[PDB]
From a paper:
Thousands of outer-arm dyneins (OADs) are arrayed in the axoneme to drive a rhythmic ciliary beat. Each OAD is divided into two regions, a head that contains AAA+ rings (rings) for ATP hydrolysis and a tail that holds together the whole complex. The tail is permanently attached to the MTD A-tubule, while the head region of each HC contains a microtubule-binding domain (MTBD), which binds and releases the MTD B-tubule depending on the nucleotide states. We reconstituted the purified OADs onto MTDs to mimic native arrays and determined the structures, by cryo-EM, of free OAD and OAD arrays bound to MTDs (OAD-MTD) in two different microtubule-binding states.
Author numbering:
A (entry chain B): 1 to 430
B (entry chain A): 1 to 440
The structure:
């Protein structure tokens, strides 16, 4: 009932997915061998939403790991819970895109898309009532971005009504690991806006910010970033797995946060994050969770919403709490910063509650807000792409793959139009 | 024999269902198994459970209820509750996926499949009952399932069933403190169907109940459970006559006779006067005069709109427990004397009074004082035009922006329905304004 098919593609995709499945298993107490070890029978009432059953009671994650660098298979097998995934789901090429979007979207991705399409088709038809797919990937890299958008387009053509949610890791000019990041990000979002149901953007520099200011971690590694994004991702579909007082599945978030089909980019956040030092100081309660999850710092994107204005926003609270408290906090923050919320929307906040908290935790919120600050984070990539495209740098790498300059023109123009749309709905008044 | 088929749509509706049914089982002392335990064997206290329950013929009393939802979560928590064996499993209907606050999705795409099974179960329960008063339907007009499925069910009930009754208990979107963004559209469409197909629509706003709780019960951190139990007390007081004998008996069918003066105007606020902490009642006298005065204080309205801005068109007071008709007459006289309270001219006699001996029970675990006197007032007032104009304004904002219409249009809903329902609401507020004036 309301099944989910997790799809991770790419190095960052595989790391995110591995950490995510680790956390969801810790939530269901499933041991890496594949069996159950928890104590609350509730942990099994919705366990099918993410795992399929196999012979011997062994639960298998309904995940689909794909990549073009075959080493990533070894990578995911190395970590704990690497034993979980059924090897049939593993799909891998041999060459690797090498940060190339086209290579992973035209030359090679077209040769693995058939196999992963067979796999996702089998996983879907195996499930009766499919809420949709939760794909996760990074736009900076080539395989991740390119193959992800290719398969997303395909599956969208195949399963139009089902939810197609995407956690995209857009690169930032701050970290700028690679150099073809602009072309990758542009040619990804150009199709993302056309196919994705809803998209959560995640920025490594924002995660580093959070891990330096909010958390005080002397050595934040990619493991910790994946940990944060996993906590978020779990918090997103929490109501799907636990009863709570007011439920909200994925489609509910979609309808409650998508004014217009082209505005499907949000900035997630996780509330109770506190450093090990200040943990004993700041007491845990609903107003504290609100103040935090609405801090411009606590967002998992690099866009400061203070510059923007929340079109709509939502929050999901885990753990038993007073509905009056949370709803009053929502109304309060609404009436406090009325400049930060669009006026034509009467009450721009959507609130939900699940009474099952994350393990070892009492209360926790997973904020998901659609803003216009994201338009700034896209202006960044837009101007970067424009700069590195005026003189046509590295363009031969892409054009040799069968892509043409018209594709870049249309992609940057589509991104520009999206930016203008967000801008208008920010400045628009009623 | 005074049967009342109960209906419940949506998560809110089903939670209220849990509340009211716990309350009823406690009233008639029906253990969670469903077997009424005999007490003292001084004679079977029959005729009591029959209003809401039905004996299967073997000592098991099943509730004449039907739970409807498109999400299998809350209905399963019901299944895995203290009342698992209590409900005949057929009535706890469930769907795979929900409308997700999308009234259209639940009205055309998803609902049109489960509505058939629900209608079957309803016709079953009806063929069981003999001399049915009417149906109660609790639903959240904010959520997709609630609003949409409720509209569909009420239409089907109207066409298939006679003049029996249709009582509607709507959890309207609170005016100030909302929970979902799309609440306006669903509420408006639900209302456009409701005003056509419902006999009585008593409104309920979680904001007002929060205020009543913190003001009186001093529970600063209320949950949906406390609200549910308050509403359960309300609908219990509404059907106390159908079960317990008193000086005056008010069957459910009498409201749709008295309170609603015109077919369109059938929305009503409600209030429950004695609501006091178990530890606070130690300081209260609780005279019937005190009860009656408090029941008209606009703060204690179960919905949130001040009748001081409006006019009382009709009221129905229902008292429970240590009630004496002399004092009731005195109290209604004093209230008619008040100036803060005003009645329309053309309605000179604005009171339907009921008096039932049964003192309202106390549920263990709910913070309410034991009490020997209680009242519940269902009042059709002009002030509800305030909340309707409020929703009109919000919906007008959103729709003039054409904000979310794409979601609904994707569900085959012709967008013309939006403007149609909004024009119907304009006509409705105009009707309220019209009948608010005096004669010439
Ligand atoms: N009084 C009261 N209202 C509730 C309760 N639970 C939910 N609600 C109301 O229900 C609304 C939320 O939408 P839902 O009730 O979930 O809608 P639904 O009919 O259950 O189905 P969906 O639309 O798919 O969610 C909120 O506006 C609440 O006011 C409750 O326990 N008590
Ligand atoms: N947040 C996060 N980002 C990562 C992680 N691993 C890699 N990345 C980002 O992913 C980008 C490279 O992705 P890549 O390996 O090319 O994925 P591919 O296209 O599928 O090969 C870099 O910009 C990294 O910043 C991780 O564990 N966490
Ligand atoms: Mg619901």
């Amino acid at each position: 009932m309301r099944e989910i098919v997790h799809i991770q593609g790419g190095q960052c995709g595989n790391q995110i997915g591995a950490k995510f499945w680790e956390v969801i298993s810790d939530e269901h107490g499933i041991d890496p061998t594949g069996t159950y070890h928890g104590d609350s029978d509730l942990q099994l009432e919705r366990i099918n939403v993410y795992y399929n059953e196999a012979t011997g009671g062994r639960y298998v994650p309904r995940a689909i790991l794909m990549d073009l660098e075959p080493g990533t298979m070894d990578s995911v097998r190395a970590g704990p819970f690497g034993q979980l995934f059924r090897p049939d789901n593993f799909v891998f090429g041999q060459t690797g895109a090498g940060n190339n979007w086209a290579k992973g979207h035209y030359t090679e991705g077209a040769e693995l898309i058939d196999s992963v399409l067979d796999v996702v088709r089998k996983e879907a038809e195996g499930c009766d009532c499919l809420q949709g797919f939760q794909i996760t990937h990074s736009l900076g890299g080539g395989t991740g971005s390119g193959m992800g958008t290719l398969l997303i387009s395909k599956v969208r053509e195949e399963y139009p009504d089902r939810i197609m949610e995407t956690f995209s890791v857009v690169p930032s000019p701050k970290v700028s690991d690679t150099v073809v990041e602009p072309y990758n990000a542009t040619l990804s979002v150009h199709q993302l806006v056309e196919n994705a149901d809803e998209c959560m953007v995640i920025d490594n520099e924002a995660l580093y910010d959070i891990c330096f200011r909010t958390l005080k971690l002397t050595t934040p590694t990619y493991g910790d970033l994946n940990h944060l994004v996993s906590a978020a991702m779990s918090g997103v579909t929490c109501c799907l797995r636990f009863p709570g007082q007011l439920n909200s599945d994925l489609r509910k978030l979609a309808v409650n946060l998508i004014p217009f089909p082209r505005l499907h980019f949000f900035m997630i956040g996780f509330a109770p994050l506190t450093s090990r030092g200040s943990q004993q100081y700041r007491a845990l309660t609903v107003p504290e969770l609100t103040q935090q999850m609405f801090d411009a710092k606590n967002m998992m994107c690099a866009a400061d919403p203070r510059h923007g204005r929340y079109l709509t926003a939502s929050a999901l609270f885990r753990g038993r709490m007073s509905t009056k408290e949370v709803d009053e906090q929502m109304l309060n923050v609404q009436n406090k910063n009325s400049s930060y919320f669009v006026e034509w929307i009467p009450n721009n906040i959507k609130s939900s509650i699940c009474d099952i908290p994350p393990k070892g935790l009492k209360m926790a919120v997973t904020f998901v807000g659609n803003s216009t600050a994201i338009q700034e984070m896209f202006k960044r990539v837009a101007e970067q792409f424009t700069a590195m495209f005026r003189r046509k740098a590295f363009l031969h790498w892409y054009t040799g793959e069968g892509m043409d300059e018209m594709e870049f023109t249309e992609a940057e123009s589509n991104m520009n139009d999206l930016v203008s749309e967000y801008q208008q709905y920010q400045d628009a008044t009623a | 024999m005074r049967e009342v088929i109960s209906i419940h749509v949506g998560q809110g509706g089903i939670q209220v269902g849990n509340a009211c049914w716990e309350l009823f089982c406690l009233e008639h002392g029906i253990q969670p198994d469903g077997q009424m335990p005999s007490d003292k064997t001084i004679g079977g206290g029959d005729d009591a459970f029959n209003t809401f329950f039905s004996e299967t013929g073997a000592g098991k009393h099943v509730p004449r209820a039907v739970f409807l939802d498109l999400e299998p979560t809350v209905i399963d928590e019901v299944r895995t509750g203290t009342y698992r064996q209590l409900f005949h499993p057929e009535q706890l209907i469930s769907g795979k996926e929900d409308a997700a606050n999308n009234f259209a999705r639940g009205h055309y795409t998803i609902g049109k499949e489960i509505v058939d099974l629900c209608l079957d179960r309803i016709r079953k329960l009806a063929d069981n009952c003999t001399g049915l008063q009417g149906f109660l339907v609790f639903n959240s007009v904010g959520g997709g399932t609630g609003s949409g499925l409720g509209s569909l069910l009420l239409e089907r009930l109207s066409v298939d069933y006679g003049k029996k009754s249709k009582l509607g208990f709507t959890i309207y979107p609170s005016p100030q403190v909302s929970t979902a963004v799309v609440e306006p559209y669903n509420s408006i469409l639900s209302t456009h169907s409701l005003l056509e197909h419902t006999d009585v629509a008593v409104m309920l706003d979680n904001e007002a109940i929060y205020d009543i709780c913190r003001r009186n019960l001093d529970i600063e951190r209320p949950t949906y459970t406390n609200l549910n139990r308050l509403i359960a007390q309300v609908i219990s007081s509404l059907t106390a006559s159908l079960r317990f004998d008193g000086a005056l008996n008010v069957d459910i069918t009498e409201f749709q006779t008295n309170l609603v003066p015109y077919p369109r105007i059938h929305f009503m606020l409600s209030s429950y006067a004695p609501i006091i902490s178990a530890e606070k009642a130690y300081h209260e006298q609780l005279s019937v005069a005190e009860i009656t005065n408090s029941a008209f204080e606009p703060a204690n309205m179960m919905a949130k709109c001040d009748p001081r801005h409006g006019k009382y068109m009709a009221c129905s007071m229902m008292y429970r427990g240590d009630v004496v008709p002399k004092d009731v007459n005195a109290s209604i006289a004093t209230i008619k004397t008040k100036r803060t309270i005003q009645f329309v001219d053309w309605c000179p006699t604005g009171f339907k009074v009921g008096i039932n001996y049964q003192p309202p029970t106390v549920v263990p675990g709910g913070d309410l004082a034991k009490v020997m006197r209680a009242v519940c007032m269902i009042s059709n007032s002009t002030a509800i035009a305030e909340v309707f104009s409020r929703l009109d304004h919000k919906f007008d904002l959103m729709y003039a922006k054409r904000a979310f219409v794409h979601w609904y249009v994707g569900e085959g809903m012709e967008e013309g329905e939006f403007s149609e329902a909004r024009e119907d609401l304009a006509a409705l507020e105009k009707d309220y304004e019209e009948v608010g004036i005096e004669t010439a």
